[PDB]
Design a protein around this ligand. Structure first.
Ligand SMILES: *[C@@H]1O[C@H](CO)[C@@H](O[C@@H]2O[C@H](CO)[C@@H](O[C@H]3O[C@H](CO)[C@@H](O)[C@H](O)[C@@H]3O)[C@H](O)[C@H]2NC(C)=O)[C@H](O)[C@H]1NC(C)=O
Ligand SMILES: *[C@@H]1O[C@H](CO)[C@@H](O[C@@H]2O[C@H](CO)[C@@H](O[C@H]3O[C@H](CO)[C@@H](O)[C@H](O)[C@@H]3O)[C@H](O)[C@H]2NC(C)=O)[C@H](O)[C@H]1NC(C)=O
Ligand SMILES: *[C@@H]1O[C@H](CO)[C@@H](O[C@@H]2O[C@H](CO)[C@@H](O[C@H]3O[C@H](CO)[C@@H](O)[C@H](O)[C@@H]3O)[C@H](O)[C@H]2NC(C)=O)[C@H](O)[C@H]1NC(C)=O
Ligand SMILES: *[C@@H]1O[C@H](CO[C@@H]2O[C@@H](C)[C@@H](O)[C@@H](O)[C@@H]2O)[C@@H](O[C@@H]2O[C@H](CO)[C@@H](O)[C@H](O)[C@H]2NC(C)=O)[C@H](O)[C@H]1NC(C)=O
Ligand SMILES: *[C@@H]1O[C@H](CO)[C@@H](O[C@@H]2O[C@H](CO)[C@@H](O)[C@H](O)[C@H]2NC(C)=O)[C@H](O)[C@H]1NC(C)=O
Ligand SMILES: *[C@@H]1O[C@H](CO)[C@@H](O[C@@H]2O[C@H](CO)[C@@H](O)[C@H](O)[C@H]2NC(C)=O)[C@H](O)[C@H]1NC(C)=O
Ligand SMILES: *[C@@H]1O[C@H](CO)[C@@H](O)[C@H](O)[C@H]1NC(C)=O
Ligand SMILES: *[C@@H]1O[C@H](CO)[C@@H](O)[C@H](O)[C@H]1NC(C)=O
Ligand SMILES: *[C@@H]1O[C@H](CO)[C@@H](O)[C@H](O)[C@H]1NC(C)=O
Ligand SMILES: *[C@@H]1O[C@H](CO)[C@@H](O)[C@H](O)[C@H]1NC(C)=O
Lengths: 240, 40, 312, 47
């Protein structure tokens, strides 16, 4: 588990250092803000249907009663250009807020805790996550348990023993093809079907797909060994 | 020989699941994995 | 999940087929690049919204030919093989239930056959392999043992399923019977999707009515002003129409950017419900339907997703 | 039963506790051992 984790951290380190595009969601936010600021400054070169885009060159050519009408055009067009920028900034800022509230929720639920929510802390089952800072952003390194190489098995919903039906306390009944076992669902670790691994409920006629197999009792030998010794003691006590 | 091709996109590998009324698959092993996620 | 991609060519809208109006419009600068860019940003994020909701699996799982799901009759929600589009009978019902000037509609990247196919992959995975196909490789399980793990998941011991399996399957079959009847019966059932089609249609209809406005020029028709007047008398008249039509696009693009942020928020909720209700089982009270969550099935709709949440 | 329950503390602490028996399933199992052990003593008197 350590050697897998220490390798997976090494693949993150290499990947970020190797490819261009991995920072895309942050570089995009830098590029949109640069593009919008650049666009806002370029609008100052625009005439807006006035005689010129240079405010001092209007004033240096026309007299005041009509130089005002040209300046009013530039005021209208530049005020419209700020309003376009601020509307773009507000709509973007609402997006970044949504992404910051998601990031805060990921910090709270994947870093300060372990999440049972599927996909919310990466693919697999969430073990833990580690935060890393980035320019204007957060990176989460989500660590997950992923089921690897699998094997198919025969299975049953219940086991029948003394005409009573038996069900797993945790996990699932599986056969290797000849013998029956009980195992935890998320990792193959077979165990003998005991009275301590299972609970009884009702009789074998009600359950579709129930199978016959023995259920082991762990206490039965701890009284039968004690019984065979007790009988040997009675045998010895015939001798005096 | 390189040229631009145009095609209907496939959605992924097709994979008929080996379902049966009494068959289960259980992992004999696991991979720990680290995925980066990046948020503004 | 989405809304119709629209591109409005601001030059062709403001200054339709006119060189003189185009040469005036250049004097307003980069606004037309901002209008075209913003609507391209929206048009691209609609494929993204659709992709985050439906493409949550990179492997197209398919139903077995045998249908021995322990008595649970999924035939209403699996694909029908016979139709030219491979959709479910409830998806076909949902598709019936929703009804010159630089305007263009752009088609979604994922056609409705491909949204039905991603929905089929998610649903065939969900029936045959539990939540496991969300964690990694799909691991099969018998459907009654999947429902047993579910019952343990809501804190009801799994013998309650196996003892009652005929009833639990008849109740699931009956509840899908009510979904079928409900969607056949009432007009308003898909209102949340139809409301999005209606707002886009209303906002574009409003944007078109603004081409018939005068804004204090002699005519609402750009060709009349250029036909009736010499070049210098025309500048003043066209420039009114430029100002008012430009402001009509600045309005419409702002209304669409706000509305796209709302459809985005709905798509991210739908992607969260796809992950947490279809690819899993949720402890979140009320998140995956009313009751205690057992499992959910996705179904496509025009520009949307329908979840059939199954609850104890 | 002792398999359905767990033990802590005593009857004086828990507000609203009630008296009932708890069935220990080892006890009647080893009672099936008790009368068999007892009969084997009775028989073993006879030689
Ligand atoms: C299904 O799982 C079973 C448990 O692992 C397995 O049975 C076990 O098989 C081993 C040999 O592979 C036996 O080993 C013993 O066999 C005799 C016992 O007298 C000795 O000669 C050997 O030295 C060794 O002690 C186990 O006894 C046996 N266990 C049981 C409970 O039968 C099956 O072989 C597996 N089936 C398949 C199809 O793989
Ligand atoms: C699971 O194990 C059970 C115990 O070994 C076994 O039960 C036995 O089933 C047979 C066949 O049904 C019964 O045979 C009797 O059936 C009627 C009388 O009821 C007569 O027509 C027959 O001639 C014969 O007497 C056994 O009585 C019955 N035994 C018990 C103790 O219930 C199950 O059949 C096994 N099931 C599987 C799937 O392996
Ligand atoms: C729950 O079960 C308890 C155990 O049987 C029971 O406690 C017993 O209550 C009686 C009546 O109060 C006591 O009787 C004795 O009380 C004093 C000595 O403490 C004497 O003066 C009396 O003459 C009499 O001998 C028992 O001593 C007491 N048992 C113990 C072990 O303390 C509770 O009363 C029961 N409560 C309910 C609500 O059912
Ligand atoms: C687990 O089993 C499935 C299919 O079921 C088995 O089919 C036989 C091969 C035999 O083992 C039966 O007793 C089982 O019922 C396997 O799926 C097959 O995979 C191979 C490639 O490995 C492919 O050529 C076959 O067409 C598949 N058959 C079917 C019916 O799907 C699966 O690979 C097995 N998994 C493991 C890890 O053993
Ligand atoms: C579980 O998977 C790991 C690999 O992730 C297996 O470890 C490898 O085992 C082989 C020999 O079987 C070695 O050559 C490799 O060098 C091992 N790799 C590592 C990272 O240790 C492991 O053996 C598998 N176990 C089972 C029971 O399947
Ligand atoms: C699953 O449920 C469907 C819908 O009730 C069943 O389909 C109907 O079956 C009857 C009898 O065969 C036909 O007359 C109807 O025309 C069918 N209706 C439709 C819409 O196809 C189906 O038979 C059930 N399947 C199982 C295995 O129970
Ligand atoms: C599984 O299906 C077969 C038919 O292919 C049937 O004989 C068998 O009894 C079924 N078992 C269960 C548990 O449904
Ligand atoms: C048999 O019983 C006698 C006492 O009666 C004792 O000394 C002896 O050790 C016993 N042996 C065994 C094998 O129990
Ligand atoms: C519950 O409340 C009633 C009064 O309404 C009281 O008589 C009773 O003793 C209370 N039960 C307990 C266990 O204290
Ligand atoms: C008494 O013990 C003998 C073995 O020593 C046994 O055969 C017999 O059945 C027993 N009788 C009774 C009444 O238990």
């Amino acid at each position: 588990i350590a050697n897998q984790f220490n390798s997976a951290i090494g693949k993150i380190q290499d990947s970020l250092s190797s490819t261009a595009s991995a920072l895309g969601k942050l570089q995009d936010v830098v590029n949109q803000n640069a593009q919008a600021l650049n666009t806002l400054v370029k609008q100052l070169s625009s005439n807006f249907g006035a005689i010129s885009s240079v405010l001092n060159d209007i004033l240096a050519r026309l007299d005041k009663v009509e130089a005002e009408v040209q300046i009013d055009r530039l005021i209208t067009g530049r005020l419209q250009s700020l309003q376009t920028y601020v509307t773009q900034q507000l709509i973007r800022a609402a997006e970044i807020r949504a992404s910051a509230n998601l990031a805060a929720t990921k910090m709270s639920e994947c870093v300060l805790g372990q999440s049972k929510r599927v996909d919310f802390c990466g693919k697999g089952y969430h073990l833990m996550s580690f935060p890393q800072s980035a320019p204007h952003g957060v990176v989460f390194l989500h660590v997950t348990y992923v089921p690897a190489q699998e094997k198919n098995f025969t299975t049953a919903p219940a086991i029948c023993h003394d005409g009573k039906a038996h069900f797993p306390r945790e996990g699932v009944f599986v056969s290797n093809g000849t013998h029956w076992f009980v195992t935890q669902r998320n990792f193959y670790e077979p165990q003998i079907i005991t009275t301590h691994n299972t609970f009884v409920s009702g009789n074998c006629d009600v359950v579709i797909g129930i199978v016959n197999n023995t259920v082991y009792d762990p206490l039965q030998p701890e009284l039968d060994s004690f019984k065979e010794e007790l009988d040997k003691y009675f045998k010895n006590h015939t001798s005096p | 020989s390189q040229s631009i091709i145009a095609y209907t996109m496939s959605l992924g590998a097709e994979n008929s699941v080996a379902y049966s009324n009494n068959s289960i698959a259980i992992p004999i092993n696991f991979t720990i994995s680290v995925t980066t996620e990046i948020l503004p | 999940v989405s809304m119709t991609k629209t591109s409005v060519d601001c030059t062709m809208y403001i200054c339709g087929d006119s060189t003189e109006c185009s040469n005036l419009l250049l004097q307003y600068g980069s606004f037309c690049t901002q209008l075209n860019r913003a609507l391209t940003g929206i048009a691209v994020e609609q494929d993204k919204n659709t992709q985050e909701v439906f493409a949550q699996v990179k492997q197209i799982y398919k139903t077995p030919p045998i249908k021995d799901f322990g008595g649970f009759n999924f035939s209403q929600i699996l694909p029908d093989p016979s139709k030219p589009s491979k959709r479910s009978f409830i998806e076909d019902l949902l598709f019936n239930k929703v009804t010159f000037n630089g305007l263009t509609v752009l088609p979604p990247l994922l056609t409705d056959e491909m949204i039905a196919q991603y929905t089929s992959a998610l649903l065939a995975g969900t029936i045959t392999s539990g939540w496991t196909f969300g964690a990694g490789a799909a691991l099969q399980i018998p459907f009654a043992m999947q429902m047993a793990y579910r019952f343990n998941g809501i804190g009801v011991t799994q013998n309650v399923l196996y003892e009652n399996q005929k009833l639990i399957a008849n109740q699931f079959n009956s509840a899908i019977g009510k979904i079928q009847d409900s969607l056949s019966s009432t007009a308003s059932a898909l209102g949340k999707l139809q409301d999005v089609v209606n707002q886009n249609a209303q906002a574009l209809n409003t944007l078109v009515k603004q081409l018939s406005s005068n804004f204090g020029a002699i005519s609402s028709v750009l060709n009349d002003i250029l036909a009736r007047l010499d070049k210098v008398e025309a500048e003043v008249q066209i420039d009114r129409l430029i100002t008012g039509r430009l402001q009509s696009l600045q309005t419409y693009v702002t209304q669409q950017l706000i509305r796209a942020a709302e459809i985005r928020a709905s798509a991210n909720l739908a992607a969260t419900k796809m992950s947490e209700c279809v690819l899993g089982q949720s402890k979140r009270v009320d998140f995956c339907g009313k009751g205690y969550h057992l499992m959910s099935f996705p179904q496509s709709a025009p520009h949307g997703v329908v979840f059939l949440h199954v609850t104890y």
